[PDB]
């Protein structure tokens, strides 16, 4: 993800790149 509400990490491990920038990584 990176726009949204439900953090793309919620029942995955930080396999994002997004995984240091809490600002970032979301869906809906």
Same mark, same amino acid.
């Given at each position: 993800? %990176?726009? %949204?509400? !439900?953090?793309?990490?919620?029942?995955?491990?930080?396999? !994002?790149?997004?995984?240091? !920038?809490?600002?970032? %990584?979301?869906? %809906?």
């Amino acid at each position: 993800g %990176g726009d %949204g509400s !439900i953090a793309e990490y919620f029942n995955r491990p930080m396999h !994002i790149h997004d995984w240091q !920038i809490m600002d970032s %990584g979301y869906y %809906g």
